Amino acid sequence: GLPPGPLENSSAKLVNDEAHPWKPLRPGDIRGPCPGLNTLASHGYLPRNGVATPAQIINAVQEGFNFDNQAAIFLTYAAHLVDGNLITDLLSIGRKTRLTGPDPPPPASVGGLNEHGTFEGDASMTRGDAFFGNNHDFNETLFEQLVDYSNRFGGGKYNLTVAGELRFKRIQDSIATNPNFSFVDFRFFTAYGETTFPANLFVDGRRDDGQLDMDAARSFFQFSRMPDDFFRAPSPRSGTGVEVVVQAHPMQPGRNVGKINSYTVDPTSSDFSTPCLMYEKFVNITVKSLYPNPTVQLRKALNTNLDFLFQGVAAGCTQVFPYGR
Numbered sequence: 001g002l003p004p005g006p007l008e009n010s011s012a013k014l015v016n017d018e019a020h021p022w023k024p025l026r027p028g029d030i031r032g033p034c035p036g037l038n039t040l041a042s043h044g045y046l047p048r049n050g051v052a053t054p055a056q057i058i059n060a061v062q063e064g065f066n067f068d069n070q071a072a073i074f075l076t077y078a079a080h081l082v083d084g085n086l087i088t089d090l091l092s093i094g095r096k097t098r099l100t101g102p103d104p105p106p107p108a109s110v111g112g113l114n115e116h117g118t119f120e121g122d123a124s125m126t127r128g129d130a131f132f133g134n135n136h137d138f139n140e141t142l143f144e145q146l147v148d149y150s151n152r153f154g155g156g157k158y159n160l161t162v163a164g165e166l167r168f169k170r171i172q173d174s175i176a177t178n179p180n181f182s183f184v185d186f187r188f189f190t191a192y193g194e195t196t197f198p199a200n201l202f203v204d205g206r207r208d209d210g211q212l213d214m215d216a217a218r219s220f221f222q223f224s225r226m227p228d229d230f231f232r233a234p235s236p237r238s239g240t241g242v243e244v245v246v247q248a249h250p251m252q253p254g255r256n257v258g259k260i261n262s263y264t265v266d267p268t269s270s271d272f273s274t275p276c277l278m279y280e281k282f283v284n285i286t287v288k289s290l291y292p293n294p295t296v297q298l299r300k301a302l303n304t305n306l307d308f309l310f311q312g313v314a315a316g317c318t319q320v321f322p323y324g325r
């Protein structure tokens, strides 16, 4: 389908309503590394089995959380391009599943959001690095660290100050323990943005004060469950305040080079000085490497989804065409 447009009415409202009750997972219900999408699936804003179209994901993040349209479009089509089935137009918000339909040829993985090093990556707040064996399940130890950082820097709440300290802590923990730690290009960008999301989108819209309480935080992060009487944010937003997170501990993009404590800056990486390069590399390297010589039908689906991705790209970037026009 076409990317949905912005909300007609972007007011704060009850989103934990009669039509969107929380339900526990049934056998085969897929939850993944994103507490946002997990919660929308667990409240039936998305299909409850965690397999969705890009249009369903965009509508769900807007209606359920008041995620802004451009960010919704960028993230959804980026995720779909690397993790989703472009022919069936289905994306798993977690594990690889036959429910996304017949697979494209290798090297494309269609691994869902669980696929490491496409969208999902290292130094997640409440999920472990893939190197440690699980990049998608809620981790009580990591969450307890989030609670401790909220106690120390947020007066018991998660806010942008906490995000800044925790984002840096999780990077230093990956540097110290993950010899395969990667923090470049797409992951470098999204890792910073995702730390603002709890402060911008998990805070009840009637307060919208950027102070997330730990009960609400656990309910989203662990149980994919809106607080009772949860109001979505009172206006469209995504990553506002990311500048505060970055400013706390400015980092260069880089990777461990096969050993712990070997963090080596990558001058080829995009950073916040080159946002258009992040887009260009995502398309010319990441997407193109999954689909280097696509057949007629995949080429058309790639070109359509690449146009949709570009609609999410901040104005001032030149669209790139790895498969021509």
Ligand code: HEM
Binding pocket: 033, 034, 035, 036, 037, 057, 061, 065, 067, 071, 072, 073, 075, 076, 079, 113, 119, 120, 121, 122, 123, 124, 125, 126, 127, 194, 195, 197, 198, 201, 202
């Ligand atoms: C718009 C489509 C969305 C997509 C495709 C998406 C995808 C993802 C993925 C793949 C991750 C895992 C990255 C990683 O940490 O390794 C992630 C993390 C996250 N997402 Fe989403 N997301 C979306 C929207 C949202 C929304 C609306 C929210 C909040 C309401 C949200 C909140 C988060 C948070 C907090 C994390 C970090 C989890 C952690 O580090 O512990 N996302 N997202």
Ligand SMILES: *[C@@H]1O[C@H](CO)[C@@H](O)[C@H](O)[C@H]1NC(C)=O
Binding pocket: 009, 010, 011, 012, 013
């Ligand atoms: C927009 O939604 C709010 C909250 O549900 C409601 O109070 C208001 O009447 C709505 N506006 C329109 C144009 O329907």
Ligand SMILES: *[C@@H]1O[C@H](CO)[C@@H](O)[C@H](O)[C@H]1NC(C)=O
Binding pocket: 128, 139, 140, 141, 142
């Ligand atoms: C959770 O994270 C901690 C700290 O990184 C790790 O030691 C533990 O093995 C992870 N997994 C579980 C299931 O707790």
Ligand SMILES: *[C@@H]1O[C@H](CO)[C@@H](O)[C@H](O)[C@H]1NC(C)=O
Binding pocket: 153, 154, 155, 159, 160, 161, 162, 210
């Ligand atoms: C986070 O909370 C702490 C303690 O209340 C406060 O000092 C800090 O200003 C807050 N940061 C933001 C961005 O609200």
Ligand SMILES: *[C@@H]1O[C@H](CO)[C@@H](O)[C@H](O)[C@H]1NC(C)=O
Binding pocket: 280, 281, 284, 320, 321, 322
């Ligand atoms: C992407 O490819 C186009 C030509 O197809 C080129 O104009 C652009 O500079 C390339 N981007 C990068 C990352 O080299």
Ligand SMILES: c1ccc2ccccc2c1
Binding pocket: 071, 075, 189, 190, 191, 193, 194, 238, 239
């Ligand atoms: C909006 C939401 C998330 C983002 C992640 C990385 C870069 C830019 C973003 C803009």
Ligand SMILES: [Cl-]
Binding pocket: 006, 007, 067, 068, 069, 070, 236
């Ligand atoms: Cl919007």
Ligand SMILES: [Mg+2]
Binding pocket: 033, 120, 121, 122, 123, 124, 127, 128, 129, 135
């Ligand atoms: Mg991760």
